[PDB]
Amino acid sequence: HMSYTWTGALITPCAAEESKLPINALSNSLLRHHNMVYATTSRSAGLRQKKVTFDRLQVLDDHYRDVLKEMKAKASTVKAKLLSVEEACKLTPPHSAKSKFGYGAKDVRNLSSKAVNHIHSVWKDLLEDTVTPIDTTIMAKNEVFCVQRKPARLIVFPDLGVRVCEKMALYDVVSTLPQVVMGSSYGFQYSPGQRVEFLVNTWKSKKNPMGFSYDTRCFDSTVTENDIRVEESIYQCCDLAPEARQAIKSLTERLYIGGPLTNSKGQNCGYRRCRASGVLTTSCGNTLTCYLKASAACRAAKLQDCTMLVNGDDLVVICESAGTQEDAASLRVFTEAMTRYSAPPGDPPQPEYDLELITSCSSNVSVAHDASGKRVYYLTRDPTTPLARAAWETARHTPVNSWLGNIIMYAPTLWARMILMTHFFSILLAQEQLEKALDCQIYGACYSIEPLDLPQIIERLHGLSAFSLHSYSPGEINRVASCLRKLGVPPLRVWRHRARSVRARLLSQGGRAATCGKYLFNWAVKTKLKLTPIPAASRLDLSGWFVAGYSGGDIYH
Ligand SMILES: CC(C)N(c1cc(-c2ccccc2)sc1C(=O)O)C(=O)[C@H]1CC[C@H](C)CC1
């Protein structure tokens, strides 16, 4: 019952890869310790192969089947529509991997007769054949980190024509079903502020709260054929068109359960019998299966008044404490149950009794004060990976701008405001690129975003307090300070100078730019403005944001 079998062929890149941080004239203004930053490449894909390859055993008990029954009952309430080919085409990212059959993502998006003709042929084949394994491409992701080196993560995805077919069959399902099945436990329905609100209210609702995060080792590889068939059984609970049911069955049998792995050179690399990291159902499948196994494990561990929050393979549980020694014992029983269900731990879960100390979705709740001095909870994270990626993005244009996603999602944080906004607005000003729409990713989906809209986006997501936070917590200050020393990032003195410069220039341009200056950088002046609601912010169409997760799923807006 191995997760993968391999032929020995390499996982190959498509283009020249870089691992060392490129340096340009701007690099040192952000970070001096350049040797701390690296990108993963296909060179390390061999180590990853070793890591992801193991035997899965699964022993499924009555808690598991009880939870599944309840999940199916809720799923039976969902009605999902089939997308037209052209609706599905318009969801495709413009820089999505080209088809092997002589068209690309922009062909798809333009509804080119060639792409559309092929997509219809793939659809027909899905309805007619529910057995033949579908080919997938395997590639090493190029992602940037700070040292202490990780091997490249792998992405496995079918041809572009199949990906459009997945949207047709399942886009409505994966967008709608998880919230119905898991209600408030479904993480991707929340903006950062809403996630914080959910966590704080949940923490406060317990008499003696305890929480933990559970890290499954290599979650995709722990996902078994059983798990994937179970996911399919849940999808089929929905009220679907006959054609959708057939396509979902076909895609499950032919793609989701497993299939051959081909490198970018076209050599057979092996065979997958676990979750594909690059299909539409990656996020929704992982979320459901994690929720299923975790809910069942909660019952096995007899955890009292459990509240779960689940985002794909990321899991937080807040429950009633039975004291430290008992909580430790319960978590060990929880871990044992997860292991039996084929979700063994990476790091063993630790009980926490301070909400700020629980890290989930790489983030934690923290506290600061707004302009009136009121305490405000907000979501933050360790800044090391954001700053390392920002450094890469200072020297190189990347298909997804992590800095922009980080500003959007972490707008209220000390580090996003002091460093990311200051640094990148400086660059955008200098290059006259304030009005150029850039791509970023939110919950796996790709969005095109004009930097000049950032104040309205921030006000809408986080509220005006995001432009006024101060008196951050000692833990947060310590972490940010420690990160800046580690990476050799300049001090507040420097960033405050740059922010005032950036601000003054933005005000001069007028219009949306001045609004950027006024709102984003009010923190940098001695005589602060009183920031008022931005009229234009009421007229932003933020539909599609914070509905669902689409990691690996090839979704654009
Ligand atoms: C106290 C004051 C000087 N201060 C401050 C500096 C901190 C800082 C901590 C570590 C490293 C660098 C700066 S924290 C901290 C705060 O108010 O909590 C501030 O005015 C910030 C300045 C940066 C603003 C984005 C947010 C408001």
Q: Give 173-210 as a DSSP string.
A: HHHHHHHHHHGGGBGGG--HHHHHHHHHHHHHTSSSEE
Residue 289: what residue type? T
Alpha carbon of 523 to ligand 1 centroid (Å): 9
Angle among Cα 308, 312, 313 to the nearest 5 degrees reads: 80
Q: Where do we find the tokens 């609702």?
A: 205
Q: What is the DSSP letter of 360?
A: B
Residue from 71, 548, 104, 129 nearest 290 by CA: 71
SS3 81: coil
Cα gap 362→382, rounded to integer Å: 8
Other C-beta atoms lying within 10 Å of the C-beta of residue 349: 21
Long-range contact list for 434-439, CB < 8 A, 24+ apart?
434/509, 434/512, 434/513, 434/516, 438/401, 438/404, 439/93, 439/95, 439/399, 439/400, 439/401
Other C-beta atoms lying within 10 Å of the C-beta of residue 537: 18
* Residue that terminates a domain, selected from 332, 361, 390: 361
Cα gap 179→547, rounded to integer Å: 9
Q: What is the DSSP letter of 286?
A: H
Q: Do 194 and 174 fall within a single domain?
A: no
Cα gap 364→375, rounded to integer Å: 16
Contact between 130 and 250 (Cβ < 8 Å): yes
Alpha carbon of 81 to ligand 1 centroid (Å): 49
Query: Which mutation among 425, 470, 520 tests ligand 1's pocket best, with the greatest number of atoms within 8 A of CB?
Result: 470
Q: Chain centroid to CA 326: how far? A: 33
Q: Do 106 and 189 fall within a single domain?
A: no
Distances (CA, A) of 184 to 96, 170, 454: 32, 22, 28
CA atoms within 13 A on the CB side of 21: 27
Task: Tell me whether residue 347 is annotated as binding.
Answer: no
Task: Tell me whether residue 220 is annotated as binding.
Answer: no
Residue from 325, 288, 388 nearest 22 by CA: 388
Q: Do 108 and 245 fall within a single domain?
A: yes
Contact between 262 and 321 (Cβ < 8 Å): no
Cα gap 101→91, rounded to integer Å: 20
Q: Do 305 and 343 fall within a single domain?
A: yes
Residue from 143, 112, 121, 118 nearest 37 by CA: 143
Cα gap 157→552, rounded to integer Å: 8
Q: Where do we find the tokens 């933005």?
A: 506
Cα gap 179→182, rounded to integer Å: 5
Phi then psi for 408, rounded to 5 degrees? -65, -50
Residue from 415, 479, 427, 421 nearest 455 by CA: 421
Contact between 147 and 38 (Cβ < 8 Å): yes
Alpha carbon of 142 to ligand 1 centroid (Å): 33
Cα gap 108→167, rounded to integer Å: 13
Q: Do 9 and 144 fall within a single domain?
A: yes
Residue from 448, 452, 414 nearest 435 by CA: 452
Contact between 256 and 383 (Cβ < 8 Å): no
Distances (CA, A) of 464 to 194, 312, 469: 15, 30, 9
* Residue that terminates a domain, selected from 240, 273, 306: 273
Other C-beta atoms lying within 10 Å of the C-beta of residue 388: 25
Cα gap 53→2, rounded to integer Å: 7
Residue 326: CATH number of its domain: 3.30.70.270
Contact between 392 and 24 (Cβ < 8 Å): no
Atom 27 in ligand 1: residue holding the nearest Cα: 470
Q: Do 450 and 473 fall within a single domain?
A: yes
Return the axis-axis angle of helices 384-395 and 402-409, rounded to nearest 10°. Answer: 140
Kindly provide the b/e burial profile for residues 100-125, where b requires at least 16 CB atoms within 10 angstroms of the residue's own CB: eeebbbebbbeeeeebbebbeebbeb
Q: How do beta strands 259-262 and 268-272 pair? A: antiparallel
Q: What is the 3-state secondary structure (H, E, C) of 402-440?
A: HHHHHHHHCCCCHHHHHHHHHHHHHHHHHCCCCCCCEEE
Which DSSP string do the residues of 317-350 spell out, in sequence order? EEEE---HHHHHHHHHHHHHHHHHTT--BSSPP-
Interrupted backbone of the chain, residues before each interruption (C–N > 2.5 Å) = 148
Contact between 292 and 71 (Cβ < 8 Å): yes
Cα gap 551→277, rounded to integer Å: 8
Q: Do 236 and 349 fall within a single domain?
A: no
Task: Tell me whether residue 313 is annotated as binding.
Answer: yes
Q: How many domains does the chain have?
A: 4
Residue 146: in which H helix or E strand, if any?
strand 144-146
Q: Which atom of ligand 1 is nearest to the CA of 472?
A: 18
Alpha carbon of 280 to ligand 1 centroid (Å): 41
Pocket of ligand 1 (CB under 6 A): 414, 417-418, 470-472, 477, 480-481, 492, 523
Atom 1 in ligand 1: residue holding the nearest Cα: 471
Q: Residue 140 pairs with which residues in a beta bridge?
A: 154
The parent domain of residue 462 ranges over: 362-557
Tokens of 276: 């594909």
Alpha carbon of 414 to ligand 1 centroid (Å): 7
State the method: X-ray
Q: How do beta strands 136-140 and 154-157 pair? A: antiparallel
Contact between 448 and 439 (Cβ < 8 Å): yes
Q: Do 2 and 116 fall within a single domain?
A: no
Cα gap 436→454, rounded to integer Å: 13
Contact between 300 and 334 (Cβ < 8 Å): yes
Q: Do 521 and 452 fall within a single domain?
A: yes
Q: Do 507 and 442 fall within a single domain?
A: yes
Q: Do 98 and 32 fall within a single domain?
A: no
Tokens of 258: 């497993």
Contact between 242 and 258 (Cβ < 8 Å): no
26: left (phi over 0), alpha (psi -120 to 50) or beta: alpha
Q: Do 317 and 461 fall within a single domain?
A: no
Sign of the torsion angle spanned by Cα atoms 361, 362, 364, 370: negative
SS3 540: coil
User: How buried is 344 (Cβ within 10 angstroms: 0-12 exposed, 13-18 middle, 19+ buried)?
Assistant: middle
Alpha carbon of 276 to ligand 1 centroid (Å): 43
Cα gap 161→99, rounded to integer Å: 7
